[PDB]
Design a protein around this ligand. Structure first.
Ligand SMILES: CCCCCCCCCCCCCCCCCCCCCC(=O)SCCNC(=O)CCNC(=O)[C@H](O)C(C)(C)COP(=O)(O)OP(=O)(O)OC[C@H]1O[C@@H](n2cnc3c(N)ncnc32)[C@H](O)[C@@H]1OP(=O)(O)O
Ligand SMILES: CCCCCCCCCCCCCCCCCCCCCC(=O)SCCNC(=O)CCNC(=O)[C@H](O)C(C)(C)COP(=O)(O)OP(=O)(O)OC[C@H]1O[C@@H](n2cnc3c(N)ncnc32)[C@H](O)[C@@H]1OP(=O)(O)O
Ligand SMILES: Cc1cc2nc3c(=O)[nH]c(=O)nc-3n(C[C@H](O)[C@H](O)[C@H](O)COP(=O)(O)OP(=O)(O)OC[C@H]3O[C@@H](n4cnc5c(N)ncnc54)[C@H](O)[C@@H]3O)c2cc1C
Ligand SMILES: Cc1cc2nc3c(=O)[nH]c(=O)nc-3n(C[C@H](O)[C@H](O)[C@H](O)COP(=O)(O)OP(=O)(O)OC[C@H]3O[C@@H](n4cnc5c(N)ncnc54)[C@H](O)[C@@H]3O)c2cc1C
Lengths: 607, 609
C-alpha cells in the first residue's frame, strides 16, 4: 500500500488496556463518546492516513513548494493539496476542538492518538491544519469581541501561524525587536521581519490566515516580559460576518530550502515593510505576550515529539516488513557450511537486535506521549491516576520536554537502525526511510532546541516546581518496582531509578553551589541534556515493564492468535530494554557526578 | 555553500610528524626521494585544491545530479563536477601512492591517506571516480605479465575502474552471486549476469575507458565465494599493445539509482552480455582465485570509506565551530536570571561547548585512528615507527580496518548530528553544508560491507582466526602507555578501566563462541554483542590515541610553545581529558550488558515483533 504503516492495535492497547482511558468515555465531558466509537475513529483516521494523506508524502518532497515573488505567495504541489482536502472534507482539522467551535469532545490522549496517524503519513498536513486549534487558543485568550472573530476563524477553517522567531532571536525569544505601535483607534501597526515561520503562506488551501505575532509595544521593557501577542490576519475581514476584505500588510518574502519536511512552507515573514501597515489586535487587550504564546508553544512541543515518535513507528514497521522477506546469508549456527540453506535476515542476531531496539523505543515512546496526554485533562487524570488538577498540570508540564526533547532525539537516532535493516536499499529514495530521517531531523530544532528542552525540564519543571511533579512520577515507578516473571526487570528499573535520582541530586548540588561559586552553574548546563535523556530512558523502561505486566495477565487469561503474539512482544521488549538500555544510565550518573569546568575554561581558540 | 570544505592540515602534520614520526622514513629506502618538507607542501597544496576547485562543485553535484540516458546506457555528469575532476587529474592526484613504475610518487600510506582525506572532505565522489589508477595497480599486482602491460596502459591513460560484486540477491552474501562466466576456446570468457549498485559503472566522458573488475562463477564451479573468479572486463575493447580504444564491449548500465545522498556518484545496474553483445572478460592472473583477489580491492574500499566518514565529520565540526564563534544568542548562564545581561556568542554556553568538544574529540580521535592504521600498511613504516616486523604489521592493519570502516562510519554520521544541532534552525537549511554531509555519509555504514559484516569480520577473522595476536599487540601498547608526570594520571586510570572493559568484552564473546561447541545457539550471543564490541574498541583506541596526543602536547607546551601552537596543544589536552571522562566510562556498562546477553530475543516468534 502506502509508505505509512500504522499501529492502531498498540494505541488501543495503551489507551484501554494500560491507562484505562475508556473509564472516562461516556461520562461528563465525554458523555457522547463511547469506547467503540473512539476505536472506530482511530481506525478511520488510520485508513485516511494510509490512503489519501500518505499518497502525497513523496510528491511533497520531490516537487516542493515554490515562492512567487510576483505575488508574495507560495504554491503547493497539487497532490498535497488533494491530501489536505481529504483531511478537511472529513472534519479532521476539528480533532479535539471545543464543542462550541464545532469539535467532538474527547480525551487529549485520544486526540493525540488520532493525530499520530497524520504525523506518520504526512506530518506537514497536520501543521497546515492547525488553524482551528490555534483559533481555539485565540478564543481562550481573547476578549468577548475577539472570541467572536475566533469563532468565525474556526468555522471557516482559516489557517494559522505562530510568529516568534527573528534572525537574531530564536532560542532567546526575548531579544525580538519587531515593534508594535498603537493607533488612535486601538489597533496596532506591527513592524518587523520574522524568520522560519511555518505555513506563513499556504497557496489557496484557505481563505485567510491568522498570524499570532509576538512584538514589543513602543516603550515596553526588555526581554520576553516586554512582549505582547497580536492577532494579525492575512486579510482584513468583517468582524461580524467574516467577509474577507482588503489585504493586510503581512507578506512572506522567501521560502527556505530545507533538508526535509519540504512541503511545509517555512517563510521569512515581513510585517509592515511593503507599503501597507500590518494591523494587529492586542490579544485579550492585555500585555501578556509570552505567557499567551506559551499556550501555543506547549501544543507545538507536544506535536513535535508525537511527530518524531509517529515517524519512528512507521520507520520500524517498514524495516520489519522488509526484513521478514529479505533472504540473505545462512543461519549463524551454520556459518562455516557454505552450502547451508539461505535464511531471511530476521534470523540474524544483529538484525533481531536492531529490530528489537527499534520496537522497544517506538513503543516506549508511544506509551510516553499517551501517558503524558493522560495528564492533559483534569477528568482523565483524576479517573485513571487519582491525581487532582494542580498536580496533573505540573506532571504534564514535567513530561512535555521529555516528549519533545527525548522523543525528537531518540526517533532520529533509532531511524538509523531502521535504514540499516534495509542494507544498501535503505539509502535509496525508493524506500521511505531516508525521507523519514530528513523529515525528522528538524524535530530537535523547531519548537525549542534539545538544549532548551533540557534547560526547561531542569530549571522550570523540576527546580521551580520544587520537585513535586518529579517526586510523583518517581513514586509511581517505585510502587511498580515494589509490586516473579518481572523480577529481573524490576531490579534493573530500581537501579535506573536510583541512577536518575543520583543525577538529579548532583545537578541540584551544582546549581545550589552557584550562589557562592557562579561558574558552578555551568556543570548543570553540561549535564542537562544527558539528564533529560536518562529520564526518558527510565520512563520508557518503566512503561514497557508496565505493558509487559499487563501482557502477562492477558496471556495467563488465555490470549491466543495475533493477540498472544502481540503480548509476547511486549514481554520481550520490556526485558530487552531493561537489560540493554537501562544499565548505561549507571555510567551516565557517574559521568555527571564527575563533571568539571575544564571545557568551560578552555580558550575558544583551542577548539 | 560553495567553500564548504574546511581542512585541517595542522592536525594531519601533528599526527604524521609529532606523534607517529612518519618523517623517520622520508628520505630513506623506498621514500629516498621524498623529504619531510615536500610531504608538508603536498598536504598544503591538495588541501588548497580541495577547498577551492574540488569543493566548488560539492553543492552542484547534489542539486543537479547525474542524468541517465537508457538508450545510450550512459550518464551525463554536471559540468561543474567534471571541471573539479579535471583539476584533480591535472594535479596528478589520482596517482597518489601509485607505484613509481605506473607513474606514481612513492610515499608512505599514512601520507597518501592524509592527502586523500582532503578530496574526501571536499567532494568524496570525486575521489571515487578517480580510483581507476589505484585499481589498475591492484590489477597489475594480480595479473599475468601480459595483463601487467594492460594495467600499465590503463594507469598511464587514467582509465576509470569499478569493483563489480553485488547482485539483487547477493550483497552481504557475495557467495550467492549467479553471474556466470563461459569459457571460450581462445581462453577469454563471456560474462553473463546483472549486477547492482555498481559505483562509477558509467562516468560520462571523464575517461576514455573503464576497467570493470567483475566477480563471476565459471560454469560448473562450486558454490559460495570459493567458486568465484575475478575478470577484467573493459567497457571498450582496446589494442593490447598501444592502448588504442576499439569496439564497445558488451557491458551496459541499465539503471542509475536515486539516492539519499552521494548523488553525483552514479550507482548503477550493470548488465553483462544481455544486449546481444558478449561481455568479454579476461581471467585475472589467469587463475581461479576470485574472492581473495577481490579482497585486495575491498580492503582499499573499506579504508577509503572509513577515511571518507572521518573527513566529513572533520569539516562538519569545523563548520559548526566557525558558526558557533559568530552566533550571538542568549545571556551567559552565570547571568541567566538577569534579563538585561549582555548577549553572548553561543560558544559561551555549556551545552554548545559540550557539543563542540564531543565533535572535536571524535573527529580528531578518528583522524588519529586512520593514520595509526596506515602506519601498519608499509613494512618499512611499521618497522621504523613501531618496531614491528612485516607479518605482525599486516595482521594489525587487518585488525584495524573494520574499526576504520565500521566505527568510523557509524561514529561520523552520529556526531554530525551535533554539528547540525550547533547551527540551530539554520542547520536544517541546505544553505549550510551539514545536512548534505549527513546524507552523503549515511551510505558509509552500508557500502563496502555493512557495520554488522565489519563487526563479524573483526571478531571471527581478525581476532579468533588471528589467535588474538594483533589484538594482544595493540592492548600491550595501551598497557605500556598506562604504566608510563602525573598530569595524565586521571586519564590513564580511565584508560585502564576502558582497556579492562574491552578485554572483558572480548573474553565474554570468546566464551560464547566456546560454548557453541556444546549448544550451537550460543553463537547467537556473539552476533548480538559484536557491533557493540567493535564500537567499544573504537572508543578505546580513540581515547588512547587522544591521550598519546595529549602527552606530546604537554611536552611541547612545557618546552615553551606560544601563540596558535599553544592553543592547538591546549586543545589536545582538553580533548583527551574530555573523552576519557565522558566517553570511556560508558564501556563499563556495555561490558556488563555483553556479559548478560541471552537468547530470549532469538527465541521470540517473528510474529511478535
Ligand atoms: C484541537 C485541540 C484544541 C485546540 C488548541 C491546540 C492546538 C495547538 C496549535 C499549535 C500548533 C503549533 C505549530 C503551528 C503550526 C506550524 C508548526 C510549527 C512547529 C514549531 C514552530 C516553532 O518553532 S515556534 C518558535 C518556538 N520557539 C521556542 O520554543 C522558544 C525556545 N526558547 C525558549 O523556550 C527559552 O527558554 C525562553 C524563550 C523561554 C527563554 O526566555 P526567558 O529567559 O525570558 O524565559 P523564563 O524567564 O524562563 O520565563 C519567561 C516567561 O515565559 C513563560 N514560560 C517560560 N517557559 C514556559 C513553559 N515551558 N511553559 C509555559 N510557560 C513558560 C512564563 O510565562 C515565564 O514567565 P514566569 O512564569 O516565569 O513568570
Ligand atoms: C595501502 C593503501 C593504498 C590504497 C590505494 C587505493 C586502492 C583501491 C583502488 C580501488 C579500485 C577502483 C574501485 C572503484 C570503486 C569506488 C567506490 C567503492 C564504494 C564501496 C563499494 C562496495 O560496496 S563493493 C561490494 C562490497 N561487498 C562487501 O564488502 C561484502 C560484504 N560481505 C562480506 O564481507 C562477507 O563477510 C563475506 C562475503 C566475506 C562472507 O563470505 P564467506 O562466508 O564465504 O567469507 P569467508 O569464508 O569468511 O572468507 C572467504 C574468502 O574471502 C577472503 N576474505 C574474507 N574476509 C576477508 C578479509 N576481511 N580480508 C581479506 N580477505 C578476506 C578469504 O580469502 C576467504 O578465504 P580464506 O582465507 O578464509 O580461506
Ligand atoms: C523548519 C523550521 C520551522 C520553524 N517554524 C517556526 C514557526 O512556525 N514559528 C517560529 O516562531 N519559529 C519557527 N522556527 C524557528 C525555530 O524555533 C528556531 O530555529 C529554534 O528555536 C532555534 O533558534 P535558532 O534557529 O535561532 O538557533 P539558536 O538559538 O541560534 O541556537 C543555535 C545553537 O545554540 C544553542 N543555544 C542557544 N541558546 C542557548 C542557551 N541559552 N543555552 C544553551 N544553548 C543555547 C542551541 O541549542 C543551538 O545548538 C522554525 C525553525 C525551523 C528550522
Ligand atoms: C551507494 C552504494 C554504492 C555501492 N557500490 C557498490 C560497488 O561499487 N560495488 C559493489 O560490488 N557493491 C556496491 N554496493 C553494494 C553494497 O556493498 C551492498 O549494499 C552491501 O554489501 C549490503 O548488501 P545489501 O544491500 O544486499 O543488503 P543485505 O545484505 O540484504 O543486508 C540487509 C541487512 O541484513 C544484515 N545482514 C545481512 N547478512 C547478514 C549476516 N550474515 N549477519 C548479520 N546481518 C546480516 C545487513 O547488515 C543489513 O542490515 C553499493 C551499495 C550502495 C548503497
Amino acid at each position: 500500500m502506502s509508505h505509512y504503516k500504522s499501529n492502531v492495535r498498540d494505541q488501543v492497547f495503551n489507551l484501554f488496556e494500560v491507562f484505562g482511558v475508556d473509564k472516562v468515555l461516556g461520562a461528563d465531558k465525554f458523555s457522547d463518546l463511547d469506547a467503540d466509537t473512539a476505536r472506530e475513529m482511530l481506525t478511520e483516521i488510520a485508513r485516511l492516513a494510509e490512503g489519501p494523506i500518505a499518497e502525497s508524502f513523496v510528491e511533497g518532497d520531490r516537487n516542493p513548494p515554490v515562492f512567487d515573488p510576483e505575488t508574495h505567495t507560495v504554491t503547493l504541489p497539487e497532490g498535497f493539496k488533494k491530501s489536505m482536502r481529504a483531511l478537511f472534507d472529513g472534519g479532521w482539522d476539528k480533532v479535539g476542538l471545543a464543542e462550541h467551535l464545532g469539535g467532538i469532545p474527547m480525551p487529549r490522549a485520544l486526540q493525540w492518538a488520532l493525530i499520530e496517524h497524520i504525523l506518520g503519513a504526512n506530518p506537514a498536513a497536520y501543521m497546515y491544519a492547525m488553524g482551528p486549534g490555534m483559533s481555539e487558543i485565540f478564543y481562550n485568550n481573547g476578549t468577548d469581541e475577539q472570541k467572536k472573530w475566533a469563532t468565525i476563524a474556526a468555522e471557516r477553517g482559516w489557517g494559522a501561524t505562530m510568529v516568534l522567531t527573528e534572525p537574531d532571536a530564536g532560542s532567546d525569544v526575548g531579544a525580538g525587536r519587531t515593534k508594535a505601535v498603537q493607533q488612535p483607534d486601538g489597533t496596532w501597526h506591527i513592524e518587523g521581519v520574522k524568520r522560519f515561520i511555518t505555513s506563513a503562506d499556504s497557496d489557496d488551501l484557505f481563505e485567510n490566515i491568522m498570524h499570532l505575532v509576538l512584538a514589543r509595544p513602543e516603550g515596553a521593557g526588555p526581554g520576553t516580559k516586554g512582549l505582547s501577542l497580536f492577532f494579525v490576519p492575512k486579510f482584513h475581514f468583517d468582524h461580524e460576518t467574516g467577509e474577507i476584505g482588503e489585504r493586510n500588510g503581512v507578506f512572506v518574502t522567501n521560502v527556505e530550502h530545507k533538508m526535509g519536511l519540504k512541503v511545509s512552507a517555512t517563510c521569512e515573514l515581513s510585517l509592515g515593510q511593503h507599503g501597507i501597515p500590518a494591523v494587529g489586535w492586542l490579544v485579550g487587550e492585555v500585555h501578556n505576550g509570552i505567557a499567551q504564546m506559551f499556550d501555543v508553544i506547549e501544543q507545538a512541543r507536544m506535536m513535535v515529539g508525537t511527530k518524531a515518535i509517529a515517524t519512528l513507528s512507521t520507520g520500524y514497521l517498514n524495516a520489519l516488513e522488509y526484513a521478514k522477506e529479505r533472504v540473505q546469508g545462512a543461519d549463524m549456527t551454520q556459518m562455516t557450511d557454505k552450502t547451508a540453506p539461505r535464511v531471511t535476515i530476521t534470523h540474524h542476531p544483529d538484525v533481531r537486535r536492531s529490530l528489537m531496539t527499534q520496537k522497544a523505543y517506538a513503543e516506549g515512546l508511544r506509551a510516553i506521549y499517551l501517558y503524558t496526554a493522560t495528564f492533559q485533562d483534569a477528568e482523565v487524570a483524576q479517573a485513571v491516576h487519582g491525581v487532582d488538577g494542580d498536580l496533573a498540570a505540573r506532571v504534564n508540564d514535567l513530561l512535555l520536554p521529555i516528549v519533545k526533547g527525548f522523543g525528537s532525539e531518540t526517533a532520529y537516532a533509532k531511524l538509523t537502525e531502521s535504514l540499516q535493516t534495509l542494507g544498501g536499499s535503505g539509502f535509496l529514495q525508493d524506500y521511505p526511510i531516508e525521507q523519514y530521517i530528513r523529515d525528522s531531523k528538524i524535530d530537535s530544532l523547531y519548537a525549542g532546541t534539545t538544549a532548551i528542552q533540557a534547560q526547561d525540564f531542569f530549571f522550570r519543571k523540576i527546580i521551580r516546581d520544587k520537585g513535586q511533579a518529579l517526586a510523583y512520577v518517581a513514586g509511581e515507578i517505585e510502587q511498580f518496582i515494589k509490586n516473579g516473571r518481572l523480577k529481573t526487570e524490576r531490579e534493573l528499573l530500581a537501579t535506573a531509578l536510583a541512577d536518575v535520582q543520583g543525577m538529579a541530586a548532583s545537578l541540584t548540588g551544582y546549581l545550589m553551589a552557584a550562589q557562592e561559586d557562579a561558574a558552578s552553574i555551568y556543570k548543570v548546563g553540561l549535564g542537562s541534556v544527558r539528564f533529560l535523556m536518562a529520564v526518558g530512558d527510565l520512563l520508557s523502561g518503566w512503561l514497557l515493564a508496565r505493558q509487559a505486566a499487563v501482557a502477562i495477565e492477558k496471556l495467563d487469561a488465555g490470549a491466543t492468535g495475533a493477540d498472544k503474539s502481540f503480548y509476547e512482544g511486549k514481554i520481550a521488549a520490556a526485558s530487552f530494554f531493561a537489560k540493554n538500555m537501562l544499565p548505561l544510565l549507571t555510567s551516565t550518573r557517574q559521568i555527571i557526578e564527575n563533571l568539571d569546568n575544564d571545557v568551560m575554561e578552555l580558550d575558544e581558540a583551542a577548539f
